Design an enzyme around this catalytic site. Structure first.
Site, PDB file in Angstrom:
ATOM      1  N   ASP A 222       0.828  -1.200   0.000  1.00 24.63           N
ATOM      2  CA  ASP A 222       0.000   0.000   0.000  1.00 24.63           C
ATOM      3  C   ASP A 222       0.865   1.255   0.000  1.00 24.63           C
ATOM      4  OD1 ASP A 222      -2.222  -1.631   0.035  1.00 24.63           O
ATOM      5  OD2 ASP A 222      -2.512  -1.478   2.207  1.00 24.63           O
ATOM      6  N   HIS A 223       2.037   1.158   0.621  1.00 25.11           N
ATOM      7  CA  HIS A 223       3.000   2.250   0.600  1.00 25.11           C
ATOM      8  C   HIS A 223       3.497   2.468  -0.824  1.00 25.11           C
ATOM      9  CE1 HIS A 223       7.100   4.024   2.112  1.00 25.11           C
ATOM     10  NE2 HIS A 223       6.333   4.928   1.530  1.00 25.11           N
ATOM     11  N   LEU A 224       3.805   1.370  -1.508  1.00 31.19           N
ATOM     12  CA  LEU A 224       4.270   1.428  -2.888  1.00 31.19           C
ATOM     13  C   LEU A 224       3.330   1.955  -3.966  1.00 31.19           C
ATOM     14  CD1 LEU A 224       6.452  -1.806  -3.006  1.00 31.19           C
ATOM     15  CD2 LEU A 224       7.251   0.563  -2.919  1.00 31.19           C
TER      16      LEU A 224
END
Ligand code: EMC
Ligand code: EMC
Ligand code: EMC
Ligand code: EMC
EC number: 4.6.1.24
Lengths: 234, 234
Positions: A222-224
């Site tokens: 989700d960060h990516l």
């Protein structure tokens, strides 16, 4: 003469250890003094260390990058890696290496973000500052002239040195963008600061990250795609 | 309770001195310890100092901004203002104040750059780093939440707090641009990093600088129109 010989050599563990020893001998030479003239000399010698770190990152020898902090005496280490920079140097090196290699095109791969404690350092705002402070130091060590004689970032690569530094510093800037806009990537003001990126660079980043999220922890994933989506909008 | 009372008060020399004393008492409480838990707590308390500095800058009380470094004990001062940051803090405060006031519109004026030693600190690349490190710290202290209870950047100004921080941090970013692109302003890559600036902000900067170069030293003048011309091209 003894110094310039070493720096110009191919980057190995031997050539790296001797160089750091020389800088330290020179760096030490200012510790007895405490004036302002001492601080500027020390501040330059300090970013001579980071030049060597930035060289290792750009030369895909990240194991040599971590070794730098080891070859540095604790009193010197307290001044070169102030406060929380000491604790997150391992993470900074990895982050800088990951991005720089991507910018140089290196067909992957890189260790987990949640394993090397990088994803953990992100969730602490004060660790992000200490990481950002290191990334900035990495960048300025190769832009400025830290030695009194010109030295190529990558040995033997003279004619393409201005090109390499341009490339590396941009990578170190995008690594700086990931830090400062953590969990605020897709926001308008955060996206406007991706204007510096070349269109090819964005695509390289989108692809390398899209291929980097496969099987990873949901948190890293989700960060990516927050990063990827911010790239796809700029 | 004793703390939150003070921070919310109108910004005076009395309210500023007591607050710094409280942070120091709290900051000291970690010096006996040397672990990693101590460093993060100290790193937050450190940027509580810079919040107070950034408040003074944005409140056009620059004389209070300089006072901050004075109220801080030397051992604490060595850790909050590492190495060369100590020597250039006076210059950083002035630079941050100059830009922030411009962004807030303040109809001038500001002291000479060659008089307050700011123009001098520019010509040293290692002083620019120490200044940049401070400007960055100024910025992050008001973006992050340095206290455990929410505090307005400017007292009484609650509903417009998100607007103020947005404005101030942009100013602190343009002050960061002046530092990192010294004598390379008009270069293409340097201009691309002015994309974050609002069009009105650029005009305010162009005007305030055009009015700031009158009668100044040639060196400061040429520095300014390099800035102005970089603004007129973005
Ligand atoms: C070597 C003086 Hg900045
Ligand atoms: C201590 C970095 Hg020049
Ligand atoms: C208070 C832990 Hg970063
Ligand atoms: C020492 C700045 Hg958090």
């Amino acid at each position: 003469d003894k110094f310039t010989y070493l720096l110009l050599q191919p980057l190995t563990e031997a050539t790296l250890s001797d160089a750091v020893n020389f800088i330290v001998e020179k760096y030490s030479a200012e510790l007895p003094d405490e004036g302002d003239a001492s601080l500027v000399v020390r501040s330059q010698l300090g970013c001579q260390f980071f030049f060597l770190v930035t060289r290792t990152l750009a030369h895909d020898q990240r194991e040599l990058a971590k070794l730098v902090q080891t070859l540095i005496p604790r009193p010197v280490r307290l001044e070169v890696f102030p406060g929380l920079q000491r604790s997150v140097f391992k993470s900074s090196v990895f982050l800088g290496h990951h991005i720089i290699q991507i910018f140089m095109g290196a067909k992957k791969p890189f260790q987990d973000w949640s394993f090397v404690g990088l994803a953990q350092d992100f969730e602490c705002p004060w660790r992000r500052l200490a990481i950002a402070e290191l990334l900035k130091k990495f960048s300025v060590s190769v832009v400025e002239k830290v030695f009194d004689n010109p030295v190529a970032l990558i040995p033997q690569h003279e004619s393409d040195n201005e090109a390499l530094i341009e490339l590396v510093t941009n990578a170190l800037r995008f690594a700086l963008w990931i830090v400062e806009f953590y969990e605020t990537e897709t926001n308008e003001k955060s996206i406007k600061e991706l204007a510096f990126l070349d269109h090819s660079s964005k695509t390289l980043l989108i692809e390398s990250f899209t291929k980097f999220l496969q099987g990873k922890d949901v948190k890293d994933q989700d960060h990516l795609k927050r990063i990827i989506d911010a790239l796809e909008k700029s």
